[PDB]
Each structure stands twice: as C-alpha cells, then as structure tokens.
Design a protein around this ligand. Structure first.
Ligand SMILES: [Mn+2]
Ligand SMILES: [Mn+2]
Ligand SMILES: [Mn+2]
Ligand SMILES: [Mn+2]
Lengths: 440, 444
C-alpha cells in the first residue's frame, strides 16, 4: 500500500491514543449495513483492547441536523465510519478531534480524513469503511483484520478475490494467524442449516434451479443421492464429492476462496458474518450485530440467526413471486411491479438475485418498482456486461426522475428513484429512451 | 490413486478420535523428533484444535518399552503414536484405553491389537520408504476431521526424503488433495534454501538439496560466482532484477539441472518459506532438542518463536558448512570397495551423517564408492555409512554389511541399504573397515 494511505493511518491512531490516555469516552458514528456495522466493530474492539470506553450510534443516513446536535455533546473524539466525506466542512464545525473513515466519492484543522479515493485507490473495488477503519487502528490492534474483510464482502468488493488494500489486509491477517483460507463450496450457513436449506439460501454465488426453492433443492439432492436433511460436514465424503462436481455444473463460481477466522467458528465463514450483520441492519437491530463483532455469543447469536432465517424466507417469497409473475420488457429495459407490502423493503435485493439466477435476463437492465402510497420507489439493477456496453443507471434515473419532479441517482450498476405514481409509464418510457441512447 | 484398505483404516482411526473428543478428554500424542515426527504430531494437534479438543504432545528420540510401561500409569484414554509404534505393538497392546499407531517403518510380525488402530503403508501394499511418511499416515487418520493440514503431511514427507522425481504414491494423492482444497500451490522455480529470509549469497551457500557443486557450503565461492556473473550478491532472491534473475536460472541449471523444478508453497507458511524450507526449520529444531518451538510452528505461532527457530537453523547451517569445509580440505581415504573419513572433533560428532551425504551429492567425494563417516566417542567410534542409489543397484546394502561387521567385534549395527549406522570399539576400527570392505566387494 502507498505510504500516504498508511501515514494517515498513523495520525488517526495517534489521535485515538491522546483521548484514550485522557480517559475520554470515544464517539463512534457509523452506517447500518455490514460495512458500517463491522467498521464500528473494528473501532470498538481497538478501543476495548486498551481498556478504553466507547459509545456507538448507527444511522441509516447522516444529515447535518444530527451533526448540529452532536456539537452540543461532551465527547472529545468523533469517529465516523462509512460516512463523513460528503459533510466535511459541516463536520469541521465540530470541535474536539474528529476521524472520518469513509470510502465514498469525496466532495479540517482538527479532522483526520482517511479515504482511498484521496490516495489513488478505488473505494468501490478495493477498500471499504471497515478496511479504512482498520488502517486507522492497525497500530493499536491487528486482531480485528478479519472484520475489515466482512465489511468488504458486505459491500461486494470481491469478484476474483480481494484486490488492492483489501488484499494487503487479507495477507496481513494471514501472516498474523487470525485468518485462514481454503477453497470449498461457498454455501450459505454450512454449520447451522441442513444441506437442503443451505443450498436454497445460497443467493451469492447463485445456483440457478436451486437457490430460493426448497422443494427443488430437496428433489435435486434426493435424485442425486445425498442426505438432504443433514448439515454439510455431517454427510459422507463419497456423498460430498457428488455435490462438488454437481454444483459446479450449475454455477462454477460456487467453488472458490472461503475465509474462516477462529473467533467466528461455529457461526460461519467471513461471508456468512456479512449475511448475519446485513439481516441485523435491515431489522434495525443494531446492538445485536455489534455484539457479534464484539464477541457476544449466547442468546444474541440465537436472535441474530432467527433474524436471518426470517429475512431469508422473505427473499424466497420473494424470488417465487418473480419466477411466477415475471418481468415485462420494453426495448432497452425490463421491469417488475409490486404493491405488496412484503416486497417493499427487499425489491432491490430480489431484483439483483433474479439476474444472477437467470430467472430474468441479465443482459437487459431491470427496474424493480414498489408503490408507496401516491409515489413509487424504483430500484434499478443490472450486470457488469450491460455496463460495458454503455449503461449508467444512476445518470438515466436521476435525469428521468428529475423531469417529473422526483429525486433519483446512484451508481452505474445500481440506482434508485422516487416518482409520482401517475407518471410511472412515462418515466419508464423515458428511462428506456435514455438507456437506448447510452448503448447505441 | 489410493487403496480402499488404506482409507477404510483411515476412517476407523478418525471415528475413534471423535468418541474421545466428544467424551471431553485430553488426547495423548507421542511422536518422533525429526521433521516427519514433529510435523505428524502437528497434523494431529491441528485436527484436534479444529474441534475445540485438547491435546498433550511428547517428543522422543526413541521409543522404549520403559516409556510405554510408564504410560500405562497415566489416565489419558486415547494414545496417538506417530512415526513409531509398529516395532512395539504387543507392548503397546498392554496399554488400555484406545490407541492409534500412525507409523511407516517395517512392521514387526505380531500384529496384535483389540483396541489398537494400526495404520502403516507396508500393510496395504505401498512403500513406506518412497511413498508415505508418518505425517501422511497421520493425515490419513485425520482426513475426515480436517483437510487443512495436508501441506504439513508433505513437510514430513520431504523431511524423510520421499521426493526424487516428485511425490509418488500416497504422497501424490495428498499433494493433489491439497491442491483441489486450495491450501497448497505449485510452481516451478529455482529451489534455493530460504529465498525470503536470506540474501542470494547465503541462500545459494545453504542450498544443500539439491546440491550445487562449487557453491553449496562455501560463502566466498558463492560470492565470487555471483560477482563475476553480475547478480546482486547482497540482496534477497525476489529483490533482484528479472534480467539479473534469468542469468541465475540458466547458470545454476548448468551446475545441477535438478535445481529447477517443483516448489511447494502454502499461504500459512508464507514469509517463512516453501514446504521444504519448513522441513529444514523443523529438523534444526529437533537436532537442538527444542521441541515446543517446532510444534508451535506447525500450530501457527509466529512471533518470537519463528525468530528463535530461524536462529537455530542459521547455527545448524554454519556447523554443516564447517563441516563440508573440513571434508573439502583433508578428504577421504579409499580402500578397495569403500572410502572413509574420520573425526575426533566435537563439532562434527552429531552431523557426521548429514555432511557425509551432502559431500556425495556435491561430488567432493566420489558418489559411486560407498562412504563411511567415523566419529570417536571416547573408547568407541560411531559409524554413519552413506551411499547413492546407483551404488545400491550394483548390489550394495550397508545395513547388512554394517550389522554383520559391527556384530563380529561385539558392537551393534544396522539400518537400510542406502544408509546405515554402527558403533564399534576404537581399537577394532581398522579391522572393521577391512571387514566392511570385504563384505561390500562380495555384495557387488
Ligand atoms: Mn460501505
Ligand atoms: Mn455502507
Ligand atoms: Mn518417518
Ligand atoms: Mn522420523
């Protein structure tokens, strides 16, 4: 890694200790998905390892109002993870010390700002808030390195292996003995569920035919002769390699790098921890997720795993609705529409999973639509190959949403928009005209 | 390629291990004190850790009936003997609890064991000298609990030199099982000793297998070599220039073409070395009777324990150099069917065998003529005979010649065809050497 993205790692650590010695309760503010939760986890644990105290706040969004209210608070050091780079001068109205460990496009006399974009690395491909927070805490605690990779996996910075800064973290964790590697099947929750649910709940990497379908996973295993009601390590080795060769035919990306650390044994691999923490964040059950990062494992784990079961039944219900209804295709896009309450807060995820599964055509860009009273919430999702031909959903949605009075934006591969219910057809024709312009 | 017999006994062994692990009890590991023995215990220890079990290791130079007698007092319900056991099986069977023996030496004809699981390649039609070591046998006992230990099975293999033209048999089955599992990578490169930890001049000078005639065991010569051919002599192997690197590949291959070949790296041993560097670290630990350091390496300890392990290898290697220097000067005397070298020097007393072997690979001493290394030990003399496979093919068996010859003067001897030992009274040494000479001439 660059000496810049490392020398700033050291200023961050040195400021953390000048408050830890001064006996002060360090203030952690972070985001509410796997990257945000695990990042706070990294800082929390750094702080615990030196008998320090901390107070976490988990937000869906950072607003100037929250930062205004923060300026009333005693707490001498503020630690923003996975957010901060958008509101830096507003933050600088805060006094004390302040650390911002983000990785989003940037926009500080007492402010330490660490962000990969400022040191020539891609904050979308190579480093997440959890890794950035690790680089701020590396000289206090290196035992947190595996959690840095949970957040990375959380934000999907993994396609053909951890790249860049995250690779530097994996190999730093490997040398340090806290993170082991082995190639295996990457089924969801291999220690906690029997083989039929594990397969059915493997959403990434997808298994077309099997993923999100219980009877189909059961009948599959029945016919090929492996114990459908036993958990993955309890089978017979002759029954095991039927599975490796069979699942690799359906999707060969199923076999690959698995990441295990001893502290997460009997929960799962590192990408199982990304799953538990995301499910905790969707349920606004922050505390359970952070307790996992901190090492709590009695009934807090039991509650976390119950949350993931219920989130996963919803996703299945879910893809089932998509397999039956299907999508309508215009010229340069396809869309799917729901007024059903169950699919309102998952429309994005199921949209994405249905492309990976080839239920819906992954080449044609997909807009998922949830009615929200008199408006409609839009989650656009596509595949990298559609981006290479010229698609940018963020630009198309922002422009298209704006023109009817609605707000939209996001990335090239995934974008959102909110539009009035009465303008939906027109909007969909307008996103269709823009995407056709974008590609030919 | 692996017989269902050698895997079905692999399964009994595993299933007995779990009936004690579930019963909450501290499994007893007893193993030998070289790379195979140490790494084999490592394999079992790690199997046991992966299921939150506990273990207690004992590392011995030799297994004696006395130790086994004392073991019967212990308590520990399951005993796991690695790289030893097949010689003392009925004695072992006097032990109660359960017992696993993961060895690869010639079994003794009394295969008894009501509660004893005996796994040994010789009993399932494989060569325990060429194709499977204790570490691999121990892997076959633990394969259905943990496959992440597969690279350590190959350290022990390399430790006992089960590698000439690639891992054969069972060990090949392990390399390809490790490869599929993603824990062991392969690539062809120069096979220099300790490429990450030492600068190029010491790395060359410390490459004892494969040998580099001219360069191995000689610091100034390695230095002058690299000086003259224009490669940075004081930089470590990956820090050179690629144009400076392939001067090296083509130059070292002229001196010994076996230098280029299969290298084995596993991620857990990164920044220590390749798998045959781990064999080196562990042997050096065992020679120094420093057994918790070597096992800590197998278990993944890597702070000051690695620092201590590497300092032990530097000191063992300076000894070996001192060493071959003594042999390059002050050479061997040749009779008719053998040659010998003699030392009363304390430094060369516990390495005579190794330097004897390295000097044949280096062609300092003639590899065709069988070589006896001799250390005075007060009123006796310890003999380490060593030769090359081509001398075996013409009819040499050092074990038979030494046992018979040693015996006839009241001394003990034996071993294999390629390497043997003997202990004889100092006053009978010339006669003995004439007698080993007459026997080897008869043999060929
Ligand atoms: Mn993030
Ligand atoms: Mn986030
Ligand atoms: Mn052995
Ligand atoms: Mn041995």
């Amino acid at each position: 890694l660059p000496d810049s993205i490392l020398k700033r790692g050291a200023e961050a650590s040195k400021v953390l200790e000048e408050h830890l010695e001064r006996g002060n309760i360090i203030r952690i503010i972070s985001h509410n998905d796997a990257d945000g939760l695990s990042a706070a986890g990294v800082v929390a644990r750094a702080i615990s390892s030196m008998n320090g105290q901390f107070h976490i706040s988990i937000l869906s969004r950072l607003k100037k109002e929250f930062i205004k209210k923060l300026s009333g608070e005693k707490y001498s050091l503020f630690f923003f993870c996975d957010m901060g780079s958008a509101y830096l001068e507003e933050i600088s109205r805060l006094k004390g010390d302040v650390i911002v460990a983000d990785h989003h496009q940037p926009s500080g006399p007492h402010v330490v700002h660490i962000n990969p974009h400022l040191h020539g690395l891609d904050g979308s491909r190579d480093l997440s808030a959890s890794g950035t927070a690790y680089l701020a805490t590396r000289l206090l605690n290196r035992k947190t390195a595996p959690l840095a990779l949970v957040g990375a996996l959380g934000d999907m910075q993994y396609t053909d292996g951890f790249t860049g800064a995250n690779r530097f973290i994996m190999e730093e964790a490997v040398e340090e003995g806290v993170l082991q590697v082995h190639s295996d099947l990457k089924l969801a929750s291999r220690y906690t569920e029997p083989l039929y649910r594990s397969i059915a709940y493997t959403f990434n990497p997808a298994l077309p035919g099997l993923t999100g379908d219980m009877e189909a996973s059961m009948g599959f295993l029945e016919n090929i002769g492996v114990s459908y009601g036993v958990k993955y390590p309890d089978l017979s080795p002759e029954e095991r390699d039927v599975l490796r060769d069979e699942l690799t035919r359906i999707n060969p990306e199923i076999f690959g790098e698995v990441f295990t650390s001893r502290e997460f044994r009997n929960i799962g691999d590192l990408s199982d921890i990304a799953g538990v923490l995301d499910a905790c964040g969707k349920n606004r059950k922050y505390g359970i997720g952070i307790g996992l990062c901190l090492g709590e494992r009695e009934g807090a784990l039991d509650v976390a795993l119950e949350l993931q079961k219920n989130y996963r039944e919803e996703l299945v219900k879910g893809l089932a609705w998509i397999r039956r209804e299907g999508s309508t295709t215009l010229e340069n896009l396809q869309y799917i529409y729901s007024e059903d309450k169950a699919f309102k807060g998952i429309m994005g995820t199921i949209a994405s999973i249905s492309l990976s599964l080839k239920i819906l055509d992954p080449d044609i860009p997909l807009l998922g639509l949830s009615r929200m009273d008199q408006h409609v919430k839009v989650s656009a999702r596509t595949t990298r190959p559609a981006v290479e031909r010229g698609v940018n959903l963020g630009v198309a949605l922002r422009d298209a949403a704006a023109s009817f009075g609605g707000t939209g934006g996001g990335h090239d591969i995934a974008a959102g928009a909110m539009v009035p219910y009465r303008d939906m057809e027109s909007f969909l024709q307008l996103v269709d005209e823009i995407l056709g312009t974008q590609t030919g």
